[PDB]
C-alpha cells in the first residue's frame, strides 16, 4: 500500500519526437460558449483522474473551451481570468503539447502561438504510469512577474495558481466527457530545456488530457 | 502597492454556543448553474455583507472544496497527491474554528474563538461571515520527497479553493483566496500541531450591497 508512495523512476534519454502534421505559427480558436453545459454540481461529482486514453484528437471547439476554462479572459475590462492569480499578475502561462507542436496559449487573443515544432507529449521525465494522450497542458511559472512577491511564497503562489487552473480544466473535462490527470512529478529543468523556455520560466505542473480509453 | 504586515491582533471571543460537532446535510445536488457560466463569473470579492450562510449553503461549499464525491475509496472533489488528503480544511466562524471532516461530512470544533481575518497582512479584504483555511498537514507527507511537499500541498489547496470560488459564482456568493499569511502566527491562533501550517485562506460571503 505504501509502495505507491515510492518515488517514480526517471525516464532517461528521451528526445522530443518529430512534429506530426502542419506545425502552423498560430492556431486561432473559436469563441468559447457562455450559457450552456453540465451543471457545476454535476462536474464536481464526476471530477476524477484518468490515466489511459483514446488517441482521437479533441475537436477544435473542445480544445478552445478547455484552454479558456484553464486560462481564459472572462472579463474584458482589465483582462480578468477564469482562475485567480497573486496581485492579478499573470504568473502562469499555459503551454499545450500537441502532435503538431508545442504552443503557448495567449488568453487576450484566445489563440495558440508556436513555441516548438516538435511533439513534447509525455516529457515529464518520470514514469508515473500515465499513458499517451492527444495533448498535455504545461503550467509554466514566470519568475520575472513574481519579483515584488516575498521569495519564500513564490512556489506556493505558483503551485496554487497552477492548481486552480488545472482544476478548471478537470471540471471542464468532466462536463465534456474527457479524461484528465494533473502531474507534478516533473524533471523541471529537463522539460524546460525541451520546451525552449527562458531562464525565468519554470514548469510547475502538467496535465494529460483526452477521451478515456475504451476498456 | 505590495501588502504590508499588520501587528499582533489577538483573536476575538466566540459568539454562540460553539457546539463540538455540527452535522451537515448530505450532499445530493447535481443541478445548478452550468460550469461555463460559473467560469465566466469566477472572480475575487473583497467587500461583504455580514448575513450568515444558511446551513445547506455552508454544507455545499465545504463539499465542493473538500468533499467525498466517490463513497467507495473516498475519492474527493479535488485531486490530491497519491490520493491522500494532504490538506485539512478549517472554517473560521463567529461561533468558533471548525475542522471539516470529509468522510463524515461534518464540522469538529478546533478552537472556541473567532479567528476570521487573522492573516497578519493588510490586503484590504473586509470582514465576512466566514473564512476557509487550507492547512498543509506535513504529518501526512513524510513519505513524499521534501522538495515536492510545498508544490503538492499548494496545488491541492489551490484546486480546492478553486472548486469553492466556482461554487460561490454558482450561488451568488463572493470569495477571495488569500496567500499572504503570517503562517506561524496563524497556526498558533488555530492551535495547530507543529507539522501543520495554513497555506491559503479564503474569505467568503454575500457581496456588499452599498
Ligand atoms: C499536486 C498534485 C500532483 C499530482 N501529481 C501526479 C503525478 O505526477 N502523476 C500521476 O499519475 N498523478 C498525479 N496526481 C494525481 C493524483 O494521483 C490523483 O489526484 C489521485 O490518484 C486521486 O485520484 P482522483 O484525482 O481521481 O481523485 C497529482 C495530484 C496533485 C493534487
Ligand atoms: C496564490 C494566490 C494568493 C492570493 N493571495 C491574496 C491575498 O493574500 N490577499 C488578497 O486580497 N488577494 C489575494 N489573491 C487574489 C488575487 O489578488 C486575485 O485573484 C487577482 O487580483 C485577480 O482578481 P480575480 O480573482 O477577480 O481574477 C491571491 C490569489 C492567488 C492565486
Ligand atoms: Mg499529525
From TrEMBL, chain A:
One Pfam entry name: Nitroreductase
The keyword Nucleotide-binding belongs to this UniProt entry's keyword annotation: yes
GO molecular function, one term: oxidoreductase activity
CDD domains from the UniProt entry: McbC_SagB-like_oxidoreductase
Superkingdom of the organism of origin: Bacteria
Keywords: Flavoprotein, FMN, Nucleotide-binding
Statement: the UniProt record of this protein carries the keyword Nucleotide-binding: yes
Gene3D superfamilies: NADH Oxidase
Domain Nitroreductase: 47-211
InterPro entries: Bacteriocin_Proc_Enz, Nitroreductase, Nitroreductase-like
Binding site for FMN: 47, 49, 51, 75, 85, 128, 184-185
PANTHER family with a match to the protein in the record: NITROREDUCTASE MJ1384-RELATED (PTHR43745:SF2)
Protein name per its UniProtKB record: Nitroreductase domain-containing protein
Taxonomic lineage of the native organism: Bacteria, Pseudomonadati, Pseudomonadota, Betaproteobacteria, Burkholderiales
Amino acid at each position: 500500500n505504501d509502495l505507491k508512495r515510492l518515488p517514480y523512476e526517471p525516464v532517461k534519454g528521451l528526445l522530443p519526437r518529430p512534429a506530426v502534421g502542419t506545425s502552423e505559427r498560430v492556431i486561432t480558436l473559436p469563441e468559447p460558449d457562455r450559457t450552456s453545459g453540465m451543471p457545476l454540481m454535476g462536474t464536481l461529482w464526476l471530477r476524477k483522474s484518468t490515466r489511459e486514453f483514446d488517441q482521437q484528437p479533441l475537436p477544435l471547439k473542445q480544445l478552445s473551451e478547455l484552454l479558456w476554462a484553464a486560462a481564459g479572459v472572462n472579463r474584458s475590462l482589465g483582462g480578468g481570468r477564469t482562475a485567480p492569480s497573486p496581485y492579478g499578475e499573470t504568473v502562469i502561462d499555459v503551454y499545450v503539447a500537441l502532435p503538431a507542436g508545442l504552443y503557448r496559449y495567449d488568453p487576450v487573443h484566445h489563440c495558440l502561438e508556436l513555441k516548438r515544432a516538435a511533439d513534447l507529449r509525455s516529457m515529464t521525465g518520470y514514469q508515473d504510469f500515465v499513458g499517451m494522450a492527444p495533448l498535455d497542458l504545461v503550467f509554466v511559472a514566470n519568475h520575472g512577474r513574481m519579483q515584488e512577491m516575498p521569495p519564500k511564497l513564490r512556489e506556493t503562489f505558483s503551485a496554487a495558481a497552477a492548481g486552480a487552473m488545472a482544476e478548471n480544466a478537470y471540471l471542464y473535462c468532466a462536463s465534456a466527457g474527457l479524461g484528465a490527470v494533473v502531474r507534478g512529478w516533473l524533471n523541471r529543468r529537463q522539460l524546460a530545456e525541451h520546451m525552449s523556455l527562458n531562464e525565468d520560466e519554470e514548469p510547475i505542473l502538467s496535465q494529460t488530457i483526452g477521451r478515456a480509453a475504451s476498456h
